[PDB]
Structures are given as structure tokens and as C-alpha cells.
């Protein structure tokens, strides 16, 4: 027996590949917690075991506040990214409760459930734009614009400014410690200027939306200007990137498992179950967001010094054989199917009801209206996107639409 000091390469995070699951399993079988080179040169750990991910997700010794980063990382993150500085996503107790309170009611299940008719119209309006018996990229035609439209209408942001939101979201979702600095600063400043002007307009006649609730909190001193702007940015990013990748990953997985797609066609009621299995197997967030040791700490026997990054692999947690029978089998009937793909504890996804509802309406409507859509390319041509973001998602999903039935 000899002690081993190997550090998981950066690429395990930034450039995983088509099947990174075997690699994660090999690391996980040896230990739940490992040194990882993310960002490059940093003291950082990856957590791969389901149960230890679950503990870490809720462990208050891990801070989400950017001021708890070592100075060289803190200074770089703050100068670049409006995302990391002032929202509930990057807040510990008690700031987390203050930053969460103005928006939490808007995301309750029974409230979100009233968006069903408008979501259905958005989905139908998008499918109406498909070329019948043509070819689409499902991401650009549907998976991106559907949830962007939903969160835009729900905030009371003009749908017309779609491509600005798509670009700002993609750039500002990237890790400011790994991604081009100039790009993120420009995105931060362009987002700031747009929303400064929109808020000033919306203030002069508050409308009864979420943006009006957010403006009210700002005007009452519950949010600073930065916290209003950072909060809007999280809601926009987390609002559409995750749902986009759920529809993209999910459609690819169903086409890769055609008998289970036929099952969903025959019995549409199974679609919520299929959504949960999509989230376990290829969850839109492969990693939980920024966490740093606030103090010297031990997690599952490994000593993590103060200031170390701790990266939680939701992807690895989804395939843990301690939790799931046949973890690498995709089975839409898996039940119950408890997973960590929406996180756990105080930062549990506020969007989960809204994401689950959009998933059900999206897949129900695609399967009903396009009775036989298929891949437009050989499956080996379907590429997973590599970037510094928390995402697990496709570059593109070429689809032959086939016949298109009316809404």
C-alpha cells in the first residue's frame, strides 16, 4: 500500500467528452473526495459520492460568498462576473434569506401551476415555426427560446430582446476564473445598462410581475442596486439554460432509447417520470455552483484547508450504485427516483416546480404534435458542449421534424 497524490485534471470539469461517466465511476470507487485542478493552480476538491454530495450541498462550513475566496480568485471573479456577487445563489445565512424572500412566493408550485396555459401557447407558437417535413436544430429552434420566453414574460422583460439575453446568459454562466475576462466584463456592463434603463421605465408604473416585486425590494432597501441586477441575471440564466439542456439532453436520450420513446408516446402520463430520469442521468447542472471552505474542515476523511474550492459533481451523484440499481441504465419508469440534480438543503432550486412544469408541457407537446421526429445526423455526430460553466448540454441537436399536427 502506497499513498497517492493524484489531482483530477482540469479537463474532467472543462472537457469531459461524450461518456465521462466511466471516469467519474473509477474516481468515485476509490474515494468520494479528490484533489481537482479547477480552476488551474488552485487548491480545490471534487466530491463524487451521492451521500457526500448531499452532505456538502447543505454544509455551512462551505461558503457561497465570493469574499471567502483567496484574494487573487476573489478579485478576479468580482472584476469580471455580475453573477457571483449579489444574489441568493452566492449567499450564506443570513444574507441568503434576505435575498430569497422577495422572489420565493413567485416560484411556489400552485402559483407556477397557473402559468400552464401561457407555457402551452409559447410551446405551440414555437412548434408552429418548425418547417414541416424539414430539419431544425432543436436547441436554437425550441429548447433555448421556449424557457427564455417563459422567464422573460414572467419577469415582464420584452421577449423581442431574446438574442441579447441568449448571448449575455451564455457568457455570464462561464467561470470568471477560467473564461476570457474581457468578454465577461463587457457582458456584465451591457446587462447592467439594459436593466438599469428597463427598471427605471418599469418603476414609473409598477405592473404586477416579479420584476415589480424585485424593484419594490430595491426601493425598500431589501436589495442594493447590485443585488437587483445580480438577482435578475441568475433568474435569467438559471431560468433558461437548465430547461434548454433538459429538453436537449432529454430528446437525445429518448432518441437513443427509442422503445422508451414509444412507451412515452403510448402513455403520456409517464412523461413526468421520464423527466426525473433525464435529470438523474444527464442533469442540466453537472456541477453545483461556487463553494469554498470558510475554515479548515474535514469532509468524509479528507482535510480541506480554508480557502479551497469544493466542486460537487451532481453528474457523479446521479450514477452512484449505493443509491441506484443499474445506475448507467436509462429507465423512464425508475420509481421512486430521488436525485441531487436540483441540489439539496438551503440552496435547493427555487425553479424546480417551474422547470418540471416546462419539461412536462415541452415533451407532451413535442410527442403529440410531431408523431415521428428523428435525428437528422448519425448519433456519433451529436456533440456534447465543453465550457467552463456548470452545464451538461449539447452543441446542437439536428432533428427531422416529420409530420406536424396542429396545436
Ligand X SMILES: CS[C@H](Cc1c[nH]c2ccccc12)C(=O)O
- Interface residues with ligand X (CB under 6 A)? 89, 173, 237-238, 241-242, 284-285, 289, 389-391
Name the binder of 176 from ligand X, ligand HEM, none, CB < 5-8 A by kind: none
CB of 1 to ligand HEM, least distance (A): 36
Among 32, 248, 318, 355, binds ligand HEM (CB under 6 A): 355
Best CA proximity match to 233, nearest among 282, 188, 294: 188
Question: Is the preceding omega at residue 321 within 30 degrees of 0, hence cis?
Answer: no
Which helix (H) or strand (E) is 111 found in, with range?
helix 109-112
Which residues 6+ apart lie within 8 Å of 209 measured at CB? 154, 155, 156
Among 232, 349, 361, 397, binds ligand HEM (CB under 6 A): 349
Which residues 6+ apart lie within 8 Å of 40 measured at CB? 10, 178
Pick the piece of the chain touching ligand HEM (CB under 6 A) from 76-84, 180-188, 214-222, 276-284: 276-284
CB of 349 to ligand HEM, least distance (A): 3
Which residues 6+ apart lie within 8 Å of 356 measured at CB? 272, 275
Strands 62-63 and 374-375: unpaired
User: Binding string, 77-116, against ligand HEM, x = CB under 6 A?
Assistant: -----------xx----------x----------------
Strands 135-137 and 374-375: unpaired
| For ligand HEM, the closer CB: 59 or 183 | 59
Question: Is the preceding omega at residue 275 within 30 degrees of 0, hence cis?
Answer: no
Determine, following the binding rule CB under 6 A, whether residue 353 of this chain makes contact with ligand HEM: no
**Alpha-carbon Rg for the chain in angstroms:** 21
CB of 157 to ligand HEM, least distance (A): 12
Pick the piece of the chain touching ligand HEM (CB under 6 A) from 201-209, 253-261, 348-356, 364-372: 348-356
Name the binder of 389 from ligand HEM, ligand X, none, CB < 5-8 A by kind: ligand X
**Which residue lies nearest ligand HEM, judged by its C-beta?**
351
135-137 sheet: strands from edge to edge: 135-137, 398-400, 374-375
Which helix (H) or strand (E) is 170 found in, with range?
helix 162-172
Interacting residues with ligand HEM (CB under 6 A): 57, 88-89, 100, 151, 234-235, 238-239, 242-243, 246, 279, 283-285, 288-289, 314, 341-343, 347, 349-351, 354-355
Amino acid at each position: 500500500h502506497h499513498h497517492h497524490t493524484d489531482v483530477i485534471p482540469t479537463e474532467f470539469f472543462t472537457e469531459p467528452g461524450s461518456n465521462p461517466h466511466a471516469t467519474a465511476a473509477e474516481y468515485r470507487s476509490k474515494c468520494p473526495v479528490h484533489r481537482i485542478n479547477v480552476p488551474p493552480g488552485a487548491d480545490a476538491y471534487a466530491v463524487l459520492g451521492n451521500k457526500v454530495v448531499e452532505e456538502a450541498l447543505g454544509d455551512s462550513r462551505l461558503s457561497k460568498q465570493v469574499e471567502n475566496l483567496p484574494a487573487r480568485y476573489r478579485d478576479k471573479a468580482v472584476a469580471s462576473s455580475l453573477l457571483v456577487v449579489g444574489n441568493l445563489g452566492f449567499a450564506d445565512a443570513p444574507k441568503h434569506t434576505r435575498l430569497k424572500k422577495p422572489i420565493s412566493r413567485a416560484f411556489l408550485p400552485a402559483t407556477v401551476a397557473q402559468l400552464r396555459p401561457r407555457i402551452q401557447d409559447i410551446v405551440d407558437d414555437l412548434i408552429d415555426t418548425f418547417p414541416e417535413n424539414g430539419e431544425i436544430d432543436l436547441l436554437s429552434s425550441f429548447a433555448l427560446p421556449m424557457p427564455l420566453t417563459v422567464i422573460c414574460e414572467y419577469l415582464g422583460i420584452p421577449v423581442a430582446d431574446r438574442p441579447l439575453f441568449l448571448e449575455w446568459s451564455y457568457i455570464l454562466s462561464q467561470d470568471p476564473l477560467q473564461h476570457d475576462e474581457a468578454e465577461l466584463k463587457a457582458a456584465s456592463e451591457e446587462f447592467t445598462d439594459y436593466f438599469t434603463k428597463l427598471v427605471a421605465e418599469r418603476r414609473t408604473d409598477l405592473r404586477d410581475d416579479l420584476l415589480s416585486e424585485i424593484i419594490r425590494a430595491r426601493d425598500a432597501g431589501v436589495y442594493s442596486e447590485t443585488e437587483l441586477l445580480s438577482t435578475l441575471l441568475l433568474l435569467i440564466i438559471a431560468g433558461h439554460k437548465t430547461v434548454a439542456n433538459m429538453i436537449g439532453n432529454g430528446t437525445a436520450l429518448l432518441l437513443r432509447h427509442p422503445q422508451q420513446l414509444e412507451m412515452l408516446r403510448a402513455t403520456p402520463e409517464l412523461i413526468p417520470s421520464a423527466i426525473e430520469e433525464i435529470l438523474r442521468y444527464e442533469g442540466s447542472a453537472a456541477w453545483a455552483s461556487l463553494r469554498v471552505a470558510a475554515e479548515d474542515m474535514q469532509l468524509a476523511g479528507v482535510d480541506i484547508p480554508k480557502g479551497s474550492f469544493v466542486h460537487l459533481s451532481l453528474s457523479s451523484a446521479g450514477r452512484d450504485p449505493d443509491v441506484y440499481d443499474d445506475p448507467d441504465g436509462f429507465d423512464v419508469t425508475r420509481s421512486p427516483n430521488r436525485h441531487l440534480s436540483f441540489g439539496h438543503g438551503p440552496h435547493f432550486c427555487i425553479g424546480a416546480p417551474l422547470g418540471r412544469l416546462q419539461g412536462e408541457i415541452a415533451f407532451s407537446t413535442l410527442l403529440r404534435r410531431l408523431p415521428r421526429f428523428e435525428l437528422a445526423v448519425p448519433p456519433e455526430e451529436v456533440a456534447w458542449l465543453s465550457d467552463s460553466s456548470l452545464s451538461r448540454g449539447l452543441e446542437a441537436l439536428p432533428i427531422r421534424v416529420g409530420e406536424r399536427l396542429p396545436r
